[PDB]
């Protein structure tokens, strides 16, 4: 029988949900995992000693035709999965269904302050020896470092839009929705 043996979460710039939060939950649950850069998906697929057989993503808004707003990078992961023949699934509750908006082109996409891209928040590290810096009470300290010039313009969309053509299945509490022979999702039961 097939079984899952490993998880490859993406760092997920710029907020770093993948490295700071997902990697944390995976360690907590003791699930075998290796964190990779967002840029490493293609090379990871090509070299993985364990075949990658699926990507699972969440959603922020699934509209009537199944087009999906999710974290910036999701469309890109979908494209890479298409190119490498890897099944790509959106996983989300009915509460994440928009039953009014018709298609992905009509979704409003938050763009965030450029400083959230140019400045990285993390726990302070000793730049000489690499240990955690602890405060008087022995606790880790939050710190920020700048990783780009003041002068550079940045693009900081919080989400991208994955068209339904790239989504193999939408997985919910009500079951798994897939496309009919016309390439259309039928989500009416979730409206």
């Amino acid at each position: 029988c097939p079984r899952m043996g490993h998880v490859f979460p993406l760092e997920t710039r710029p907020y770093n949900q993948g490295s700071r939060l997902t990697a944390y939950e995976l360690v907590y649950d003791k699930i075998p995992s290796t964190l990779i850069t967002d840029s490493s998906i293609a090379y990871r697929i090509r070299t993985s000693p364990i075949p990658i057989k699926a990507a699972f993503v969440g959603a922020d808004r699934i509209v009537r035709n199944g087009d999906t707003a999710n974290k910036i990078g999701t469309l890109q992961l979908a494209v890479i999965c298409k190119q490498f023949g890897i099944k790509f699934f959106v996983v989300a509750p009915k509460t994440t269904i928009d039953n009014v908006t018709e298609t992905g082109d009509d979704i409003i996409v938050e763009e965030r302050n450029p400083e959230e891209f140019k400045v990285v928040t993390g726990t302070v590290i000793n730049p000489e020896n690499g240990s955690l810096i602890l405060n008087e009470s022995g606790e880790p300290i939050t710190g920020k470092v700048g990783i780009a010039p003041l002068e550079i313009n940045v693009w900081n969309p919080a989400f991208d839009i994955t068209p339904h053509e790239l989504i193999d299945g939408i997985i919910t509490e009500e079951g798994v929705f897939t496309k009919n022979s016309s390439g259309e999702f039928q989500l009416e039961s979730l409206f």
């Binding site: 029988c1 097939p2 079984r3 899952m4 043996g5 490993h6 998880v7 490859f8 979460p9 993406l10 949900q17 993948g18 700071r20 939060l21 997902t22 944390y24 939950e25 907590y28 649950d29 699930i31 998906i41 364990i50 075949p51 990658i52 057989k53 699926a54 990507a55 699972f56 993503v57 969440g58 959603a59 922020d60 707003a69 999710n70 974290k71 999701t74 992961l77 099944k87 699934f89 996983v91 989300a92 509750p93 509460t95 269904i97 928009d98 409003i108 996409v109 938050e110 928040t121 726990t123 955690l132 880790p140 939050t142 919080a158 299945g169 997985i171 919910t172 509490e173 079951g175 798994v176």
Partner: protein
Amino acid sequence: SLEAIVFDRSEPENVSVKVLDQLLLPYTTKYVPIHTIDDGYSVIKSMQVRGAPAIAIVGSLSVLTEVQLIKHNPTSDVATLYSLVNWESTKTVLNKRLDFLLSSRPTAVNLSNSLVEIKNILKSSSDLKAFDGSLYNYVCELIDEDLANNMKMGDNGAKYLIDVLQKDGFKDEFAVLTICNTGSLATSGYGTALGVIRSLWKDSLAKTDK
């Protein structure tokens, strides 16, 4: 540890809510108390709470904490936004504050979906006391259905993939990719995509008992 929102529901007329500051994880674990819709707006806008369902939950809870605060204390700063002697005038201000809360972050639809249901509950409420109790039941169910549905969809997805793999003749160990955070930190617990991963891991551990 991994609980994004800490909701003490044990005293229904006087709930407490505090949230993990997700900006500071994983090395630093710090809570932000939620007392008003202002606090709700602020933790959402600044992404101290994030993840589509967790946003909807904290938003919804912030309405509860506000309503209970203005009940318990007509003189608090937030209360002075209301004329509490007059139910119609109060509903109006609530509705405006709900619109304010909505504007926190636009893209994920969960918040809007919850606030629509809350506006509907408010329209059927004869006074602030009735709204209070009904909002309490609503948010409790939002959270409880969120967790139970996370585990249901987790199982659905795991069963589905193993199914598809077995049919395609695949019989070996496999890996998966995931993005962002969709676990307990993004929801009421367990999560969505990470929930499927958690279900697949349970399936895997079970299978390597045999």
